[PDB]
Amino acid sequence: MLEPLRLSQLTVALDARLIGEDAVFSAVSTDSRAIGPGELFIALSGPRFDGHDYLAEVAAKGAVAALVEREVADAPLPQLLVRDTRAALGRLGALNRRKFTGPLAAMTGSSGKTTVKEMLASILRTQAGDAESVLATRGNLNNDLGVPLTLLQLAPQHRSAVIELGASRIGEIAYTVELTRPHVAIITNAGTAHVGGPEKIVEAKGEILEGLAADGTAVLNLDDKAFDTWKARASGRPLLTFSLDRPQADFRAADLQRDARGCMGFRLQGVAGEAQVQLNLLGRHNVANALAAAAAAHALGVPLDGIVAGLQALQPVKGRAVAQLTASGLRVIDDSYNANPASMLAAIDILSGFSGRTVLVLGDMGAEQAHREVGAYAAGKVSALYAVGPLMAHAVQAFGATGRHFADQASLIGALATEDPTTTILIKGSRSAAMDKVVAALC
Ligand SMILES: Nc1ncnc2c1ncn2[C@@H]1O[C@H](COP(=O)(O)OP(=O)(O)NP(=O)(O)O)[C@@H](O)[C@H]1O
Ligand SMILES: [Mg+2]
Ligand SMILES: [Mg+2]
Numbered sequence: 001m002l003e004p005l006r007l008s009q010l011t012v013a014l015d016a017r018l019i020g021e022d023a024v025f026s027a028v029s030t031d032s033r034a035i036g037p038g039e040l041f042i043a044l045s046g047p048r049f050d051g052h053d054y055l056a057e058v059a060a061k062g063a064v065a066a067l068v069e070r071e072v073a074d075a076p077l078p079q080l081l082v083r084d085t086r087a088a089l090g091r092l093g094a095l096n097r098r099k100f101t102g103p104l105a106a107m108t109g110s111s112g113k114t115t116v117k118e119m120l121a122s123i124l125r126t127q128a129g130d131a132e133s134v135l136a137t138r139g140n141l142n143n144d145l146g147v148p149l150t151l152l153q154l155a156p157q158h159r160s161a162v163i164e165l166g167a168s169r170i171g172e173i174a175y176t177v178e179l180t181r182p183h184v185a186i187i188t189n190a191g192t193a194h195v196g197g198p199e200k201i202v203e204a205k206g207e208i209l210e211g212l213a214a215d216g217t218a219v220l221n222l223d224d225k226a227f228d229t230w231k232a233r234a235s236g237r238p239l240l241t242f243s244l245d246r247p248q249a250d251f252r253a254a255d256l257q258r259d260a261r262g263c264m265g266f267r268l269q270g271v272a273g274e275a276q277v278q279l280n281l282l283g284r285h286n287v288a289n290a291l292a293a294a295a296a297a298h299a300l301g302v303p304l305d306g307i308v309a310g311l312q313a314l315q316p317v318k319g320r321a322v323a324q325l326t327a328s329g330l331r332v333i334d335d336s337y338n339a340n341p342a343s344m345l346a347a348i349d350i351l352s353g354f355s356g357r358t359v360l361v362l363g364d365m366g367a368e369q370a371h372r373e374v375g376a377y378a379a380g381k382v383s384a385l386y387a388v389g390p391l392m393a394h395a396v397q398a399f400g401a402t403g404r405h406f407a408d409q410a411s412l413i414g415a416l417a418t419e420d421p422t423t424t425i426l427i428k429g430s431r432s433a434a435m436d437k438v439v440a441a442l443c
Pocket of ligand 2: 140
């Protein structure tokens with residue numbers, strides 16, 4: 001928060017009634033399991049719990065007051081009563097954002113939101129020479145609760161901000177972009193694999209363009225079939241386009257190449273100038289993500305060497321498609337952190353991109369249909385599937401003849417010890433499968 005707020009100065013702005021003593025808070029929490037001194041607790045209802053049941057707990061941990069939508073009789077701390085706590089949270093987020101005066105960029109899309117966010121954050125942090133001065137959305141806190149929680153983290157040390165906006169329903173981004181009011185808005189794409197109908201998806205992403213600053217820059221994907229609709233909706237605003245295919249885009253990539261790890265490198269071209277960029281990430285889609293981040297960074301005033309350095313400094317998250325090369329010349333992709341069926345299919349797509357022998361190495365997801373569909377999707381796409389775990393017995397069957405189930409990791413590892421250079425191996429499983437032990441044994 002840019003400054004502590006006083007409950008009695010919010011009755012008007014939140015349409016609230018103060019019950020009990022006045023209080024001043026310098027941060028907010030929506031969770032009794034993660035709150036401490038000086039903080040406002042916000043009581044939300046969900047499918048599993050009701051926040052209003054935890055007032056004793058938050059008072060004991062030092063919360064100064066609770067924002068509630070029903071009065072709790074004889075509460076152990078002051079209450080600020082409103083009709084809808086989701087909307088009061090939204091308003092608090094908007095109010096904090098209006099105190100912040102630095103550059104703010106936002107991005108939406110079907111896929112690549114988080115990655116463009118980390119890329120852009122890396123660029124701005126690299127240019128500033130300090131990580132703490134750039135606020136970015138933590139994890140995936142991007143929905144109608146996540147966004148105002150992120151905006152509430154805006155604080156006196158921040159100089160710029162990078163805000164992820166999720167669009168899984170119509171009107172969600174219309175609401176969150178109005179709280180956020182970015183200077184630059186990015187749409188990565190609409191309608192990518194494994195992610196309301198196509199026209200709804202296009203309309204939902206485009207909502208970002210409505211909250212954009214009046215001469216704010218729109219960053220748009222010239223390859224996307226919805227480009228012309230997004231361009232119209234962007235109305236007057238300055239526009240920067242990116243593309244892997246078109247010479248007239250503002251940001252372009254030439255001469256795409258993988259390094260020995262499999263990570264993508266390219267020549268950046270366009271209006272920021274030309275340079276070679278070596279990412280630490282896999283997949284052609286991450287080149288498009290880099291161009292979108294570069295475009296935004298350029299709109300914000302970052303020079304070329306800041307863009308390049310920021311893109312090259314970004315590392316993958318541990319166990320999230322980390323490509324490495326063993327001393328034996330084996331390519332091992334560590335994706336052992338976690339897995340769900342959708343993430344499995346995204347993994348398989350990455351692996352099928354490689355041209356020599358490909359070995360998919362799987363542990364169980366933490367049921368039968370899903371394993372079944374994962375193995376089937378892999379079939380005809382990678383050279384082999386090695387797996388461990390009883391649910392993974394269903395994947396191997398659906399995969400076919402070069403698929404092998406193993407009794408424990410120990411025999412899986414002995415099999416992989418036999419693979420030669422030019423082979424790519426991808427290792428993935430739920431956290432409970434502990435497939436990082438296989439990674440460690442090879443690397
Ligand atoms: N530009 C892109 N085009 C197509 N696929 C992509 C792109 N960027 C990322 N992906 C795929 O989507 C996965 C998730 O990347 P991420 O950057 O976390 O997307 P996201 O938009 O934040 N997803 P979510 O917040 O879960 O809606 C990656 O591991 C890739 O498989
Ligand atoms: Mg994400
Ligand atoms: Mg995300």
